[PDB]
């Protein structure tokens, strides 16, 4: 839910002639309704950023620079990124009825006493309710926090907050099964996910088996590769040029060729012309390699997976990629 009255508050204060709107693709179809309201209530012209947008890493402050005086960005908690354009982050808390999914969750959590909670931007508002519920039903509830992440909150490349909980089980609240996968990989504890959208409850160790094996296969094919591509992103929150250049030197030290490729959105199509390159390392978002591996013919590896390739980490010690600041 879009927090329109607050957006309006901020627009009118800061005297906007022109306002940009940013959404993940999941929220874009509310851009017209919001643009229509703001243009009705203020003298401002609304510019919808029509750009595909994954996260807080993906602010179009360079694209919208000069075109809009303020950016309203929905669905994300801001990162430690130094915003050029004035920006308002609206979390857009879930339009949900969480209620008689609580008892179902309790049912599946019978075996466990000390529980860690994890959730995402859109469900932050539900933490306390569910924490106090579990406590009044005999559970001990621990919520992680960290430098970047609020109490109980995580991101796809910021799992720091749940590294040090020592809970016996972890309950993730929400959809997106990258998050529970990350929880499972880092904690190596049983992990349940409640998807409050369609009421699905599930163990993520199951879904990990078959993904880990796929990653393994990827890695194994990559062991044959003699020419590598190293993908970096022009997205401000994905930009890891330092790392990319370190990886290049590493691969060259292992007497292989490697070439740095920089792009905004990464997709299979944009690797298609580099036919001499036999595999790729992602020096941008850790999710790309993991979530979209089925879309790429050639192996796409996280930097951790490349470590495995080079035998400078064991498969024993597989680790997701994380994006620090």
């Amino acid at each position: 839910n879009m927090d329109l009255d607050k957006v309006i508050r901020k627009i009118n204060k800061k005297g906007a002639r022109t306002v940009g709107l940013q959404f993940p693709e999941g929220l874009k179809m509310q851009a017209v309704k919001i643009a229509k309201a703001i243009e009705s209530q203020t003298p401002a012209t609304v510019i919808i950023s029509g750009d595909p947008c994954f996260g807080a890493c993906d602010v179009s402050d360079y694209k919208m620079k000069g075109s809009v005086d303020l950016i309203v960005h929905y669905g994300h908690t801001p990162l430690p990124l130094k915003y050029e354009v004035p920006t308002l982050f609206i979390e857009a808390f879930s339009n949900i009825d969480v209620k008689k999914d609580l008892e179902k969750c309790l049912e599946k959590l019978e075996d466990y006493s000390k529980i860690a909670l994890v959730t995402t931007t859109q469900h932050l508002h539900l933490l306390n309710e569910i924490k106090d519920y579990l406590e009044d039903n005999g559970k001990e509830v621990v919520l992680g926090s960290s430098k970047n992440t609020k109490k109980g909150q995580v991101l796809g490349c910021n799992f720091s907050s749940i590294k040090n909980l020592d809970a016996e089980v972890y309950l993730f609240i929400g959809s997106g099964n990258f998050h529970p996968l990350g929880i499972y990989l880092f904690t190596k504890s049983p992990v349940l996910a409640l998807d409050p959208y369609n009421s699905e409850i599930r163990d993520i160790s199951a879904f990990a088996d078959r993904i880990l094996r796929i990653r393994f296969a990827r890695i194994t094919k990559a062991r044959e590769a003699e020419k590598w591509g190293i993908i970096v992103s022009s997205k401000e929150g994905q930009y890891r040029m330092k790392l990319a250049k370190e990886i290049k030197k590493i691969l060259e030290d292992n007497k292989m060729e490697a070439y740095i490729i920089m792009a905004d959105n990464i997709n299979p199509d944009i690797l298609l012309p580099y036919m001499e390159l036999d595999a790729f390392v992602v020096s941008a978002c850790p999710r790309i390699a993991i979530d979209d591996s089925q879309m790429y013919k050639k192996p796409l590896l996280t930097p951790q997976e490349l470590e495995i390739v080079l035998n400078k980490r064991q498969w024993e010690n597989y680790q997701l990629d994380e994006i620090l600041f």
Binding site: L27, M29, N198, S199, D291
Partner: protein, 326 residues
């Protein structure tokens, strides 16, 4: 209007008389309510869809009334598509392979189809819940009927996702309409389909699911489910009434059979005979020529709609080839 059976393409010889070719086309469609018109944004042809050769011929004539110097193509038998068995549930996967949505497709119940065709049941997205009375009135079992999401392009798309389906509603309706516009058989308008949502799941969040995820998942599931239900292309049929002197009885009966005609009834009044037949519109092109010679001009004949019946099994493969090649 005389339910459209023949569609012919008409275009302006001068690509500058275009501004008034639009005026001409909308005048012709106003003058004759049996003629329905649309300009193909996909193709660049202005299509005129009418009630047979002669029905279209009157419209191609009334381009003289509008003064547009034009070429008019030979008419095509405008087909509709349906399915002959129920399908097992078929899964459509989202753009990332991120969602799996399962649908079963089966031929819609005759009572419901009739009610839609004869206008007892209005088309469109089933929004108001208490208006579910309409679905019941049109023959659907009430509790099952209230799960209808769209009534779209001669079919119904229905939701059995409990809890599930919570994501996709608007996108699924758009995808339902798009799926009915161009069916599985040869991209012809679909008729008389029931689409049931059997199961559903989703990988990424519901704030990473947009239109490029929902649209492909539903669209691919829907085509695949129709194709696995024994998809049938159908030709439009006519009830054909021929009134002729008895002298030409044998030649007239020959002419009817040659055009895939089967005798329905046969009445005699004095020296005259009235013959009631059923024949596909597709097989009656140039019928004025054939029927004239076969009866020495004694027969006067006319046609009424008998439905968009199934195109014959042994002829289907060729007709599909011609349509797709075009």
């Amino acid at each position: 209007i005389s339910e459209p059976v023949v569609t012919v393409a008409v275009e302006a010889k001068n690509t500058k008389d275009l501004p008034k070719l639009i005026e001409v086309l909308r005048q012709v469609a106003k003058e004759d309510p049996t003629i329905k018109v649309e300009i193909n944004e996909e193709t660049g042809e202005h299509l005129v869809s009418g009630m047979g050769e002669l029905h279209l011929e009157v419209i191609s004539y009334r381009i003289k009334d509008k003064g547009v110097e034009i070429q008019t193509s030979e008419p095509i038998v405008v087909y509709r598509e349906t399915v002959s068995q129920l399908s097992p549930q078929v899964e459509g996967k989202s753009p990332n392979k991120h969602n799996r949505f399962y649908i079963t497709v089966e031929p819609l119940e005759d009572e419901l189809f009739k009610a839609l065709q004869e206008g007892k049941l209005k088309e469109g997205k089933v929004k108001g819940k208490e208006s579910a009375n309409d679905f019941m009135e049109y023959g659907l079992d009430k509790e099952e009927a209230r799960k209808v999401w769209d009534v779209y392009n001669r079919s119904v798309f229905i939701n059995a996702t409990r809890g599930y389906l919570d994501e996709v509603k608007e996108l699924l309706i758009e995808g339902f309409e798009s799926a009915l516009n161009d069916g599985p058989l040869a991209k012809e308008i679909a008729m008389g389909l029931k689409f049931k949502l059997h199961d559903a799941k989703l990988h990424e969040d519901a704030v990473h699911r947009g239109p490029a995820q929902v649209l492909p998942a539903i669209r691919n599931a829907i085509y695949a489910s129709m194709m696995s239900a024994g998809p049938t292309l159908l030709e439009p049929m006519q009830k054909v009434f021929i009134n002729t002197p008895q002298d030409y009885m044998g030649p007239c009966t020959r002419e009817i059979q040659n055009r895939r005609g089967q005798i329905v009834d046969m009445g005699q009044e004095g020296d005259m005979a009235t013959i009631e037949s059923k024949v596909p519109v597709a097989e009656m092109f140039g019928f004025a020529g054939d029927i004239r010679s076969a009866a020495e001009g004694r027969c006067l004949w006319s046609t009424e709609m008998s439905g968009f019946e199934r195109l014959p099994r042994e002829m289907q493969n060729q007709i599909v080839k011609e349509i797709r090649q075009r």
